[PDB]
Each structure stands twice: as structure tokens, then as C-alpha cells.
Amino acid sequence: WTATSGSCKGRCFELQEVGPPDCRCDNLCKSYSSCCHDFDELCLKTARGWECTKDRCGEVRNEENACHCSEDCLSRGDCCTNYQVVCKGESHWVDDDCEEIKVPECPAGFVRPPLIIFSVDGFRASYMKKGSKVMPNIEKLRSCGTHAPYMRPVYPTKTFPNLYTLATGLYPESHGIVGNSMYDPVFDASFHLRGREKFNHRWWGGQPLWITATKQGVRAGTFFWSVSIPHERRILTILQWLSLPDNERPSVYAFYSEQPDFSGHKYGPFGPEMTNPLREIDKTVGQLMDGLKQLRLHRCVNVIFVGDHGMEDVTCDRTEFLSNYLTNVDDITLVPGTLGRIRAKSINNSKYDPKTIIAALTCKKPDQHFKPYMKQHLPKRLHYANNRRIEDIHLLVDRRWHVARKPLDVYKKCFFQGDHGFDNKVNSMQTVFVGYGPTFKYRTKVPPFENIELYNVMCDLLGLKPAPNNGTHGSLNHLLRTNTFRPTMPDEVSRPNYPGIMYLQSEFDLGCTCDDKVENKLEELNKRLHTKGSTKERHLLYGRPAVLYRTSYDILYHTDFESGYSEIFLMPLWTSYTISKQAEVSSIPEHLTNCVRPDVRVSPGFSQNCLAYKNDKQMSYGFLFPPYLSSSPEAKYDAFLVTNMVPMYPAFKRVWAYFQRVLVKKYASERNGVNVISGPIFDYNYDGLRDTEDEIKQYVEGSSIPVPTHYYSIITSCLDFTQPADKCDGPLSVSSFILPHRPDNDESCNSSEDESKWVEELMKMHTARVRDIEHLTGLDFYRKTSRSYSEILTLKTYLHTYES
Ligand SMILES: *[C@@H]1O[C@H](CO)[C@@H](O[C@@H]2O[C@H](CO)[C@@H](O[C@H]3O[C@H](CO[C@H]4O[C@H](CO)[C@@H](O)[C@H](O[C@H]5O[C@H](CO)[C@@H](O)[C@H](O)[C@@H]5O[C@H]5O[C@H](CO)[C@@H](O)[C@H](O)[C@@H]5O)[C@@H]4O)[C@@H](O)[C@H](O[C@H]4O[C@H](CO)[C@@H](O)[C@H](O)[C@@H]4O[C@H]4O[C@H](CO)[C@@H](O)[C@H](O)[C@@H]4O)[C@@H]3O)[C@H](O)[C@H]2NC(C)=O)[C@H](O)[C@H]1NC(C)=O
Numbered sequence: 001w002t003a004t005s006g007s008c009k010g011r012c013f014e015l016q017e018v019g020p021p022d023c024r025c026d027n028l029c030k031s032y033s034s035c036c037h038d039f040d041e042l043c044l045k046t047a048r049g050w051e052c053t054k055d056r057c058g059e060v061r062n063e064e065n066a067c068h069c070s071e072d073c074l075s076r077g078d079c080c081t082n083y084q085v086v087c088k089g090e091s092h093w094v095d096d097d098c099e100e101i102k103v104p105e106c107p108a109g110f111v112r113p114p115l116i117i118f119s120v121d122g123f124r125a126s127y128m129k130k131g132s133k134v135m136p137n138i139e140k141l142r143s144c145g146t147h148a149p150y151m152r153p154v155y156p157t158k159t160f161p162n163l164y165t166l167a168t169g170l171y172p173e174s175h176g177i178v179g180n181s182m183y184d185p186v187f188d189a190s191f192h193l194r195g196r197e198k199f200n201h202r203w204w205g206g207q208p209l210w211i212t213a214t215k216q217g218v219r220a221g222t223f224f225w226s227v228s229i230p231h232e233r234r235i236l237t238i239l240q241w242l243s244l245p246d247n248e249r250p251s252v253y254a255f256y257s258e259q260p261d262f263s264g265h266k267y268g269p270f271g272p273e274m275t276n277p278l279r280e281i282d283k284t285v286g287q288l289m290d291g292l293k294q295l296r297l298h299r300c301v302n303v304i305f306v307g308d309h310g311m312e313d314v315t316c317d318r319t320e321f322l323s324n325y326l327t328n329v330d331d332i333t334l335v336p337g338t339l340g341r342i343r344a345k346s347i348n349n350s351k352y353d354p355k356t357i358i359a360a361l362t363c364k365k366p367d368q369h370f371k372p373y374m375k376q377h378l379p380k381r382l383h384y385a386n387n388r389r390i391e392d393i394h395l396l397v398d399r400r401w402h403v404a405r406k407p408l409d410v411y412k413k414c415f416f417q418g419d420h421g422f423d424n425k426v427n428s429m430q431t432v433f434v435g436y437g438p439t440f441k442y443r444t445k446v447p448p449f450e451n452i453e454l455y456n457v458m459c460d461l462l463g464l465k466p467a468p469n470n471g472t473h474g475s476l477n478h479l480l481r482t483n484t485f486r487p488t489m490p491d492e493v494s495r496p497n498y499p500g501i502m503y504l505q506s507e508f509d510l511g512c513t514c515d516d517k518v519e520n521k522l523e524e525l526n527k528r529l530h531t532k533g534s535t536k537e538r539h540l541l542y543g544r545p546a547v548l549y550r551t552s553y554d555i556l557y558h559t560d561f562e563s564g565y566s567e568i569f570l571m572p573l574w575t576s577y578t579i580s581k582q583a584e585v586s587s588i589p590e591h592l593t594n595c596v597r598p599d600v601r602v603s604p605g606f607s608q609n610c611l612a613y614k615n616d617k618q619m620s621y622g623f624l625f626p627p628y629l630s631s632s633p634e635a636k637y638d639a640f641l642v643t644n645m646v647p648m649y650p651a652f653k654r655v656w657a658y659f660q661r662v663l664v665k666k667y668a669s670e671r672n673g674v675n676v677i678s679g680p681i682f683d684y685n686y687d688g689l690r691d692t693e694d695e696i697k698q699y700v701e702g703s704s705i706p707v708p709t710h711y712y713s714i715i716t717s718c719l720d721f722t723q724p725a726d727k728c729d730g731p732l733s734v735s736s737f738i739l740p741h742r743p744d745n746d747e748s749c750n751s752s753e754d755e756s757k758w759v760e761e762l763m764k765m766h767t768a769r770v771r772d773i774e775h776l777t778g779l780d781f782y783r784k785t786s787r788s789y790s791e792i793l794t795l796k797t798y799l800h801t802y803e804s
């Protein structure tokens with residue numbers, strides 16, 4: 001209950017919120033039913049519209065007007081945005097030539113260039129090019145400032161998850177806004193797009209930019225705009241705040257547009273009806289830039305023009321129904337649409353079985369336009385699992401489709417021709433970034449990057465220290481003319497041991513055999529050189545990875561590969577090897593099929609054993625350095641050391657062997673050599689972070705050999721592919737993956753066929769950034785290169801997306 005009978009006189013769009021039950025006069029007031037009775041009258045004026053006309057020039061101030069054309073308007077800070085154009089012979093900002101902003105040109109009293117975030121809903125990346133003829137203001141920001149060809153959203157590619165990601169630098173799983181609707185099982189509460197529940201603070205985790213700013217003595221504008229406040233009034237409000245006294249004036253501001261999303265849902269992304277919404281957003285940008293120029297701030301303020309997600313063609317007839325797959329369809333609740341999330345209709349049911357629900361949804365029709373997953377089995381690049389609000393069962397929906405429980409859900413609610421929310425790698429979901437101002441570079445194109453990175457940069461733009469987030473601070477330094485952030489490499493926590501030959505063969509009782517008793521002095525020093533590190537410059541091209549936690553591990557050198565071998569997990573953390581364009585693939589000789597050899601540099605007690613694999617009827621083993629890529633018959637024996645072995649499900653060895661036997665050599669031929677680092681990952685609590693030993697839920701039967709949840713590879717070459725991977729003078733090129741270590745290939749509907757028809761497709765779906773692997777391993781890669789650290793940080797955030 002409010003006492004709505006105070007007044008907004010002299011308080012319109014006040015910046016501090018007055019608490020109940022005073023009445024309120026800010027942007028939230030409508031949405032809380034809490035505005036003073038005179039808010040519309042005083043604060044939402046509309047008379048005479050939003051443009052000065054010649055006849056109003058020099059008019060006598062009439063305080064009823066929406067905006068002013070009177071001589072006193074600039075001093076009052078409330079002119080119409082076109083005042084100077086109509087009444088003082090000035091040019092619109094868009095009609096002015098682009099001129100480099102080498103230094104901030106600010107009025108006296110300005111301590112720092114302000115930041116304005118202009119966010120647009122549903123603004124698909126390709127609009128920049130396809131709508132260029134009708135967005136002159138936007139095209140000028142883009143060509144004259146710093147721009148990417150696209151920006152990658154977060155999954156799900158919905159509004160509130162992406163805008164709150166923009167504000168926090170956090171993945172949805174960490175900030176808590178994991179969909180546009182959410183059931184929390186502790187709140188027994190749903191969050192939706194309509195309703196007041198969304199306004200409760202318990203949903204919104206992390207530290208958004210406006211709080212970061214305020215804690216550090218930098219003042220912020222509203223980020224939230226009530227829907228009924230028209231755009232022209234949002235712009236005028238920002239421009240009025242910008243005229244406040246020095247001690248009262250915010251340094252950071254946001255504008256949000258509901259378009260072009262709103263129309264895109266009705267008409268599809270490139271419907272003829274979309275040209276007008278793009279024209280109207282462009283006009284709004286023009287108003288802000290003309291208002292900035294009037295106030296002499298157009299070469300002082302940093303402007304970010306940024307989208308939350310794109311828009312795809314989606315129609316009612318492209319709906320998959322769970323009613324066509326399940327019988328028990330009334331025992332579940334589905335969060336439907338461009339993603340699916342499934343849980344139990346009633347937590348009073350020990351008869352609910354997720355295993356059976358998954359199997360009834362797996363590879364059931366040939367055309368099937370979705371794929372079910374347990375959340376921990378989703379691609380690690382989505383970072384979509386470590387939250388109670390994300391249901392255990394997830395459906396990834398194909399682009400252009402919907403999922404729903406039953407037909408009536410879709411007709412007892414065709415409306416719509418567009419939607420979004422698909423996998424964040426999908427081209428139609430990509431959005432926009434432009435940065436314009438003294439602190440951004442001039443006429444610069446940068447590569448596509450992820451929206452999780454922008455929080456750090458906005459903090460940099462404002463002189464703030466960012467709260468802990470998921471960006472990689474420094475990875476976007478190349479956007480900026482002046483950086484206050486100079487990243488440095490994390491310190492190595494654990495130094496390796498370099499063991500020599502310390503054990504006799506008969507000390508090992510591993511239950512392993514190898515046919516290797518097949519005895520020259522020219523090649524007797526030569527092999528000693530190899531075990532001591534003589535080929536190490538060829539196989540370890542970027543220095544050894546740094547271990548960033550306390551552990552015990554050994555570096556092992558070999559002719560063909562180098563490894564960092566963990567005495568705690570009884571396997572390599574990493575294994576590094578270079579395959580030139582010229583290298584040959586060979587077979588595993590028949591006499592060496594089951595060969596496993598003790599490593600005389602490593603104790604029996606810190607070694608794996610073959611007996612356990614024999615007793616474990618589910619579990620088999622593979623090798624991290626592949627025997628197929630041995631440099632010589634004699635070097636091949638090094639690939640069968642017990643220190644190169646890793647636990648692998650037979651189903652997974654199909655994937656791994658094809659990767660090792662066919663794809664590495666393909667990449668070396670295409671990329672003119674590759675350097676490969678491979679290894680295990682343990683993420684049993686699916687938090688995206690390296691597990692400690694006491695968090696492992698599965699061991700090779702009867703042993704202390706831990707079972708990885710995933711296997712990684714980082715594949716690096718020269719970006720200038722006229723140079724070989726091992727002699728590259730310049731920038732690097734990388735692709736990486738994190739494959740799930742699964743006992744079946746149910747994820748791949750075509751896995752009964754030859755590996756050449758399904759394995760690469762799987763690996764593409766599980767593409768990853770180097771940074772994702774760093775989080776999952778506690779390792780730090782690329783420590784010794786000739787490149788700047790900033791460039792290396794950009795390389796570690798790169799994702800190879802395999803979209804056309
Ligand atoms: C993306 O970047 C983010 C941000 O850096 C990072 O997330 C951080 O990861 C840290 C390690 O997992 C974690 O550190 C401590 O967590 C708590 C402190 O938490 C509270 O206080 C902070 C600070 O202001 C809050 O931010 C935090 O918010 C979370 O919880 C809210 C709901 O309560 C929610 O609104 C908000 O969205 C957020 O949710 C997310 O995080 C939680 C975990 O915190 C998840 O469960 C959610 O699903 C959601 O993802 C909290 O309000 C500490 O208490 C921990 O201390 C443990 O572990 C210590 C290890 O050093 C150990 O010394 C202690 O013993 C202690 O153990 C005790 O508790 C155990 C169980 O925790 C118990 O069994 C044990 O026996 C003993 O009693 C952690 O130090 C940060 O909270 C987290 N921040 C955020 C914002 O998520 C991500 O890791 C990256 N992602 C990637 C892939 O890099």
C-alpha cells in the first residue's frame with residue numbers, strides 16, 4: 001500500500017528511490033503501481049511533440065510542452081533535440097564528417113568521459129549490413145568508431161539472460177537469470193516476462209555495473225525503463241541528467257529499445273515490415289547524438305550500441321510435440337519454445353524417471369528437430385548447468401523450430417513468424433557491438449567476441465575495479481585507444497619434477513605385457529638425448545603450461561611428445577606434440593595391439609595398472625599421444641608407456657581413435673602442421689572448474705585411477721599458413737574441443753555408421769575456447785610465445801564455431 005497523494009513537482013525522474021509509503025517519481029514507479037498522482041501530468045509531458053519547428057524558435061517558455069525551443073532551453077537542459085538545427089542553423093550530427101577523437105573534449109566540471117549504453121532488443125548482426133541504407137546514424141557510429149562483425153550472446157539467447165550478462169560479466173548459471181521464465185524449486189515460484197515476481201531482488205545475483213559504480217563513488221542513471229515511457233522521453237531524460245550539477249550528475253547511463261525484437265516476432269527477421277522499426281531506432285540514435293552535440297558532449301561521451309540477441313524464422317507449423325514421443329506426458333512440466341526444460345509435475349513422485357524420459361526422446365524420428373540432454377552433458381561452451389533453476393533434463397532445439405508439450409498448448413494460448421533463444425553459436429542469434437568515443441579506437445574493426453567480456457571494458461571506461469566475473473580482463477584491450485588494465489600472467493603454483501631412470505622393470509607388478517624385447521651406439525646416446533628433452537622445442541612450441549594449484553607432477557620427455565604427469569591422478573594433466581604437414585600415419589603393429597610398458601622414471605605406486613582395466617568390464621583405455629603418429633618404429637614403443645594411458649569407455653574410444661588416426665593428420669595437412677595438447681578433465685559437479693580429488697565419483701574398478709568426465713584438445717598453428725606450425729613468426733590460429741567421456745554414443749543418432757559420418761559433427765558441437773579448458777584444468781597455456789599478452793588473451797577466448 002502506497003500513499004499516492006504526494007507530488008512529483010521538482011522530482012521527475014529523480015535518481016534516488018524514495019521508499020514506501022512516500023510516493024515515487026522514477027522509472028520503476030509505474031511498474032510498482034507507486035507513482036504520485038501527478039506523475040503523468042508533470043513527468044510525462046507530450047504537448048507539441050518532440051521537434052522544434054521554425055515557428056517555435058525563440059518562443060516564450062511554456063512549461064506544458066514536451067520539450068522547448070525557447071532561448072533559455074540549453075541553460076535549462078530541456079531543448080528538443082533538433083533545437084540547434086532548426087533554430088540556430090546547426091547541422092545534424094549524422095551530416096557532419098567523421099573526425100578522430102584523439103582526446104576527450106568535455107565541458108569544465110566533467111571528471112571523466114560519461115558512458116552511454118544504447119541497447120537494442122533482437123538486433124541481429126546482419127542488420128548492420130542488410131539495413132545499412134535506412135540507418136545513417138548507426139552506420140556512422142559503426143564506420144567511425146570501433147565495431148565487430150558480430151557479438152556472441154549467451155545461451156539461452158533470450159532478453160533477460162543476455163542483458164543481465166551484459167550488466168555483470170557473468171554466465172546465466174552464475175547470475176541466476178537462466179531463462180525468460182524460471183521455476184525456482186526452493187522459491188516454489190515462477191519468474192515470467194509479465195508479472196511482478198520478476199521485480200524481486202532474490203532472482204538477481206552477482207554485481208551489476210550500476211552497483212559496481214555506486215560502491216566506488218561513480219553515480220549511475222536508471223538501467224530499467226517502464227514500457228509506456230516513450231523513447232523520445234527516455235532520450236530527453238538522459239540529456240537532462242547530463243545537465244545536472246557536477247556533484248549530482250551520473251557518469252553511466254543506459255537506453256533500451258524493445259525494437260526491433262517486438263516486430264521481428266510478428267514479421268520474421270527480414271519481413272518487409274522490419275524496415276520501419278530500423279528507421280525508427282536510427283532516428284532515436286540521431287536524437288541522442290544531436291542532443292549530445294547541443295550540450296557540447298558529442299566528442300566527450302563514450303557510446304556503446306549493443307544488442308542482446310538476434311532473431312530467426314520460426315512458425316507454428318515447426319513445432320515438435322512431446323505428446324508424439326511420450327505416453328506419460330501429463331506427469332511432466334515443460335518450459336517450452338526455442339529450448340526445452342523438463343521436470344516432474346509433482347515432487348511427490350518417486351515414480352518419475354528421467355532416464356526413461358530421455359530414452360523416449362532420443363533419436364526416435366529420423367527428422368527429429370530437438371535433442372535431449374542431461375544438463376551435465378550439454379556442450380561445455382554453453383556453461384549451462386551449475387544452477388538449481390536449470391532443470392536436469394534439457395532439450396536443445398534446432399534453429400527454426402519450437403518444442404511444446406501437446407498441440408493444444410500452441411492453439412489454446414499462427415501469431416508469430418520470428419523467435420530466438422537457440423544455441424548461442426547459431427548465426428541468426430548473433431547480435432551487434434559498436435563503440436564510439438574518445439576511449440574507443442577510430443575506424444577500427446575488431447574480431448567477434450562474447451558479450452561476457454564487456455562488463456570488464458565498461459568498468460575500464462569508467463575507472464572502476466570490476467567485481468569477479470567470467471570475462472578475461474585484457475582480452476578486449478584492442479578495442480581501446482587508452483587502457484587502464486595491463487594484465488599479467490598468473491604465477492605458477494606447482495613446479496614440476498624432472499625424474500630420470502629410477503626403477504628396474506621387475507619392481508613393477510602392473511599385470512601389463514608388451515612384445516618389446518627386440519634389441520647400435522650411434523642411436524644409444526641419441527635416445528638418451530630424447531628422454532632428456534632434445535626434441536622438446538619441436539613438441540612444446542609455446543612453453544610448458546603452468547599448473548595454478550598445489551599438486552605433485554613430473555615432466556616426461558619423449559622423442560615424439562612431452563607430458564606433465566600427475567602423481568595424484570595417475571595420468572597426464574597435459575600431453576604436447578607437433579605433427580608437421582609431411583608426417584605419416586602408421587598402424588598399431590599386430591604384435592603391439594595390447595602392449596603396455598612400465599615407465600622406469602615413475603614409481604609402481606604412482607602408476608596405473610592393466611589388471612584393473614581387465615577387471616573393469618565397462619572401462620577400457622586409450623593413449624594421449626597417439627601410437628599412429630609415431631615418428632619411427634622405435635619411437636612408437638614410447639606411445640605404449642603406462643604414463644601415456646588414460647581410461648576410456650569403448651564407446652568413446654570410437655571417437656578418440658578416429659580423431660587420432662584420421663583428423664589430426666587432416667588438420668596438419670590443411671593448416672600446415674599443428675601443435676596438439678590433449679588431456680583429461682574432471683568436472684563431476686558440473687561447475688566448469690577443475691575438480692579436487694575428493695570430488696571424483698568414479699574410478700576404474702578396484703583402483704585409485706580416476707575416470708575423466710571429458711577429454712580436451714587444443715590445436716594450434718600459424719595464422720599465416722604459408723609458415724609451418726613449428727616455425728611461425730607471427731600470430732597463432734587455434735581450435736579446441738572438450739568431448740564428453742560417455743559410455744554410449746546416444747548423442748549421435750548416426751553412430752551405428754562409419755566414424756567418417758558422425759565423429760567430426762560431434763566434435764564440432766563440443767568446440768571450446770582455450771579459456772574454458774583452463775577453468776576446467778587449473779592450467780595456464782601459451783606462456784612462452786613471441787606475442788603480446790593481450791593478443792594471447794584474445795586467442796584464449798577465441799571459439800571456432802563452424803557456422804558458414
Ligand atoms: C564465473 O565467475 C563467477 C564469479 O567469479 C564464478 O562464481 C564464483 O565461484 C566461486 C567458487 O565456486 C564462488 O566462491 C564462493 O562461494 C561462496 C560465497 O557465496 C556467496 O557470496 C558471494 C559474494 O558476494 C555471492 O556472489 C554468491 O552468489 C551466488 O549465490 C546466490 C544464491 O545464494 C545467487 O543469487 C547468485 O546468482 C550466485 O549463484 C551462483 O553461485 C553459487 C555458489 O556461490 C551456485 O551454487 C549457484 O548455482 C550459482 O551459480 C553467494 O551469495 C563461498 O561460501 C564458497 O566457500 C566454500 O568453498 C571454499 C573453497 O575455498 C571453502 O574454503 C569453504 O569451506 C566453503 O565451504 C563451505 O561450504 C561448502 C559448500 O559451498 C560446504 O559443503 C563445506 O563443507 C563448508 O561449509 C566459495 O568461496 C562464488 O560464490 C561464485 N560467484 C558467483 C557470483 O556465482 C564462476 O566460478 C565463474 N565460472 C567459470 C566457468 O569460471
Ligand SMILES: COc1cc(-c2cnc(COc3cc(Cl)c(C#N)cc3C(C)(C)C)n2C)ncn1
Binds near residue numbers: 255
Ligand atoms: C515485461 O517488461 C520488460 C521490460 C524490459 C526492460 C525494461 N528496461 C530494460 C533494459 O534493462 C537493461 C538494459 C541494459 Cl542496457 C542492461 C545492461 N547492461 C541491463 C538491463 C536489465 C536492467 C538487467 C534488464 N528491459 C530489458 N524488457 C523486457 N520486458
Ligand SMILES: [Ca+2]
Binds near residue numbers: 122158159261308309
Ligand atoms: Ca530481447
Ligand SMILES: [Ca+2]
Binds near residue numbers: 690691
Ligand atoms: Ca568441478
Ligand SMILES: [K+]
Binds near residue numbers: 615616617618619
Ligand atoms: K575393461
Ligand code: NA
Binds near residue numbers: 748749750752
Ligand atoms: Na547413437
